[PDB]
Amino acid sequence: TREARISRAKRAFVSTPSVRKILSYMDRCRDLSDLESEPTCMMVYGASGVGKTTVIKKYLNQAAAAAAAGGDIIPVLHIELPDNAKPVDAARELLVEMGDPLALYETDLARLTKRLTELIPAVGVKLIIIDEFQHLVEERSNRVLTQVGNWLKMILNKTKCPIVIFGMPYSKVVLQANSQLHGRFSIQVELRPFSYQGGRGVFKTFLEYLDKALPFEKQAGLANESLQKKLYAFSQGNMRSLRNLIYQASIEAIDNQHETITEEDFVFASKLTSGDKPNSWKNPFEEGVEVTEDMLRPPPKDIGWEDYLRH
Amino acid sequence: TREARISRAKRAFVSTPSVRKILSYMDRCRDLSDLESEPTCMMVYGASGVGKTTVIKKYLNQAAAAAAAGGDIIPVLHIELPDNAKPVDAARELLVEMGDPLALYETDLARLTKRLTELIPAVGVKLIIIDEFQHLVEERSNRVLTQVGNWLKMILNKTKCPIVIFGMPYSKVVLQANSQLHGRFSIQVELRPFSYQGGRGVFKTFLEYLDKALPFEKQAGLANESLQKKLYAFSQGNMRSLRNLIYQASIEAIDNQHETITEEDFVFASKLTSGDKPNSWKNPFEEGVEVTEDMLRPPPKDIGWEDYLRH
Amino acid sequence: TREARISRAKRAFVSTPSVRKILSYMDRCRDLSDLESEPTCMMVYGASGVGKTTVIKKYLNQAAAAAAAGGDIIPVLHIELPDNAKPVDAARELLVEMGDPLALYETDLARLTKRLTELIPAVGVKLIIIDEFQHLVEERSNRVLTQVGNWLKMILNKTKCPIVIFGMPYSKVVLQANSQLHGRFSIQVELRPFSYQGGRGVFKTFLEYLDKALPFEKQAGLANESLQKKLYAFSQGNMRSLRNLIYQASIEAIDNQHETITEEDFVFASKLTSGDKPNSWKNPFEEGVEVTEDMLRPPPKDIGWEDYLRH
Amino acid sequence: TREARISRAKRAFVSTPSVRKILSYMDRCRDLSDLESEPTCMMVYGASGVGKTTVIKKYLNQAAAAAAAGGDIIPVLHIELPDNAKPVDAARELLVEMGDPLALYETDLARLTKRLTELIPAVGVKLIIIDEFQHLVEERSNRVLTQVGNWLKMILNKTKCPIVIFGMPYSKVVLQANSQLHGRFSIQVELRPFSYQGGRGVFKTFLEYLDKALPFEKQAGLANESLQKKLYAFSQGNMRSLRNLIYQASIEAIDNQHETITEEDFVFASKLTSGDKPNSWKNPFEEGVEVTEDMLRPPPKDIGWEDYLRH
Ligand SMILES: Nc1ncnc2c1ncn2[C@@H]1O[C@H](COP(=O)(O)OP(=O)(O)OP(=O)(O)O)[C@@H](O)[C@H]1O
């Protein structure tokens, strides 16, 4: 098995230009906010499985590895909002995250704000990052709760720490609720999936950078004339499912004697990870499924919005 | 009576290839998830009485017998979700299950998440398995609650422990609620009942492996030309009712002098366990009921879905 | 009695060349229509009791037995139009027939067309067959309603599924109503009854194939020099009455000790099934009725048209 | 069989100059209407089976293939009016056609006009095309309903989108009902069938372009001195029946060993598709039928008007 090759095949990262555009903007946000005056407050979108958490873990690596190895400073922070977040609920988890506090046996929402606003200059927080903004909409109706939104405006105007919010593409109507939240968050971006399969894409260079990143030491055989056809036939532009199927083929090749990912084990990888796909999506690998041109069609605009049509 | 023969007739297990396919996939999931990076998160389906609980008890036997006899490690865990599960309700029972905690006199849902995420690396949990996913749909309407779903995504992204969910076939629309839950659960399988009676089935080999597994030391007389006809006439493909009727015949044969299951006591076993069957299902054993070809017809696709049509 | 012999005497089928000509044309229509472009849309005629329903049940046997035993595909469909069919009335019964829908508590005729045109590629309908086209003419006048005709053109041009219409010979003036229906239905055939008695007919071979098909294991005595004379004297060319009288003799022979259909029990069969015949038709079997040559005269052209003269 | 040759023999298109005259006029109508001021509103006629639907599918190919592959724009639209169209009935189907709406559970005819007039600039409709205008006349009487006509004038004057109406030649009296509809539709054309067989016709070049379009790789033998005689004897000028008989011969030649359509299999094609023809039409192919000069007579003016004489 040689589990080093397995973990080294799973932990692989390809920097598409949108990702480095993002990380450049967050360093821009980090040492552009001067902690004297009003911050910049970027907002990042992206659908399910487009690489968001990988982006922020890249960011806390390249921004906080040496400063977390040096001492208890914690300049950048990483937060997910729990579902249907009460303002005291999000505030207390954001508080027990940073520092070494006890911090949550009292739930009073004024005095823990006191403790968090005295601690946010005490350890020297350079940036606060929130992962999951779509948790503030109701399940069965599309009312949105902005107790946490006005609380986040309060902690923004209290201490001038920059905030970078990630979230689903349907989570922006929450920002359409509070207009002061809408104006305070100026930079919204678009981390949409891979666009086309027609040729000379960013998809190409991503694919062959992943190919040299793979643990097989000669060639992976991928990013070819017909392979990206069935690859884009399998995953829409969907980064998580593409990488998942690729990893599930790579483990199958390293289970036995195999020199590269080839045409006997990539099929069984299509057999496993075909579960999340819809019924009208077509299964292209086993016996005779040639792929029409309409099925490599680019992803629509409401690609991170199908959590929202039904209600 | 000789109760050893009774318990040894009840506890009998036949490994059909779908079961070993499952258990191979869960060892694949166990030492494929590296506990560094993102897990694999299999999902298992199956209707009522298709052998699910027997599969997981086989699994905790073959995976945790020696490690539970060695010390307090508890690498694999077994959980059922209680009905209409609150997120704190499922979390506290999942917490009192593992370790030796007190764990449930406080119901605060942030600090018990704290305790569970510090304990899930402390004892070294290799796998968490949930039995009953269909308990998250409402009785009278088909609203589904995904407080527990977003909480399970939270505990998935917090600590990278693999999760194997079992459940009813109509319970997958719950996974259709949250698209991030849908994408995070890639491997969905199909544990459907026995398909046909026409000949050269998996049903055959299952039947005669059960026949050699029976406590009668010469031959059970089953898996014959006409016996599987009335067997598939009694149980649809339904593993629980087939095994139940077989056990109820075996006890009747060992109650008195009988050398094998035969044509006087298998009838009284059809007399007892005919209660759960529908009205239009035909009762084939007593006096003259010859079985038409249409009544050995394979089970439909909505065979684990008749909890769902009426509302 | 031995009811196997009774059902095996009733369910007997003789393939005259017009029937196999038909079934060849409907397989021609099935895999000639490519479901990309414009279909072929055969029309079949035939008077009362000429074997139409038996032909289509033969067809769904030989075309859909294995595919209906395999799963829920339903490639070929079987429809009768109810009398004075409203377009929503025919559409809703054609809808509840295929698939497993609820489908008829709403009667809106635009949204059920929506459901039927999304379902006709969803299950993969290869062919739609309609039995009763003569139900679209008014009783007391010969106005014909073509709401259903233009609706059938609409569903024909919407999805390109081939349609095979059966019906009475006077039902073709309905197709003379809409000229686009007239041009879209190109292949009209003629399933007329048996032509003559005079010798070397198709009637001969049909008769002795029925004779070997009968449950009597030596000879039926039929298709002889004088027996087909009184047979064609009884039934005009009328398949239903000929087969009905033959079956009513065969049951009378198997009621008691009889070795073949003979000249004591075939008479009582003429006594029973002489009711539907006209007054000027002559009753030839009992005491002395020798049959003239003019009474074996071939059937006229308006043999499926006597529902139409009076108004 | 080689189904590629079958579909490639069915999908063949010959551009007679009237068709390219039409398509030139609809591009003229598309980018002559400026969407600022009053549109041009062409009207197209033609009898049954003269190639209308093929013309518009050619048009949406050559006008909307790349723009439908690019994104959700849908510049040109394709509509058939259902039979006896209510204004809300035609409006709701024209609405669910374009865009991705729900659109038809409310039938209120003022608010769906609101939605359609805000959506017709939202997606950027360049052209609306209606197939079936003859559905607005009553069956049994020649009253015509112009609720849909005044509604179409309303949507024409509301947003200035050009409209191209196809329809039967007897459907123009509907346009004679509303004089404002009559004046708003200026360009009416004449897509009549093929005129003569006497020599040097457009029929000639059409016939040999179809001959080189056929799947037989040497010569089809057609468009000769005597073959177009019996061809025009079979089909009047009728494009659908001519192409249908030609296709039914081509399949018969490719069923067995045959090198071209010849004089044994073209006859059986005349045997099949002779059903839609009238009684006084003469059947010319089998044994000795030489064709008089009067039977190649040009089609009359009321050739798309025989749906209209009887009432
Ligand atoms: N740049 C990249 N190069 C290689 N693999 C990547 C890259 N980005 C993402 N992936 C893969 O995609 C998978 C999904 O990552 P991630 O969870 O960050 O997406 P996401 O949009 O955050 O999904 P979710 O929002 O549901 O958490 C990861 O397992 C990772 O291996």
Ligand SMILES: Nc1ncnc2c1ncn2[C@@H]1O[C@H](COP(=O)(O)OP(=O)(O)OP(=O)(O)O)[C@@H](O)[C@H]1O
């Ligand atoms: N492989 C097998 N060999 C022999 N017997 C089996 C096998 N699988 C299941 N059974 C029998 O079927 C019965 C039902 O088992 P089980 O409860 O696991 O099914 P289930 O689908 O989990 O039902 P439920 O979901 O309602 O608990 C058991 O009593 C067991 O004896």
Ligand SMILES: Nc1ncnc2c1ncn2[C@@H]1O[C@H](COP(=O)(O)OP(=O)(O)OP(=O)(O)O)[C@@H](O)[C@H]1O
């Ligand atoms: N080929 C055949 N061989 C033997 N019997 C036949 C054959 N065709 C028809 N019959 C007999 O004729 C009887 C009438 O059949 P059927 O109802 O199909 O005729 P039909 O024209 O459809 O009458 P209707 O239109 O009134 O239903 C059947 O009971 C059947 O037994």
Ligand SMILES: Nc1ncnc2c1ncn2[C@@H]1O[C@H](COP(=O)(O)OP(=O)(O)OP(=O)(O)O)[C@@H](O)[C@H]1O
């Ligand atoms: N230019 C052409 N070249 C070759 N074949 C053609 C051409 N035009 C039409 N056809 C053939 O004629 C047949 C009838 O086409 P179409 O339905 O468009 O006529 P139509 O007048 O629209 O009939 P309807 O109005 O009843 O739909 C088609 O199957 C097509 O194959």
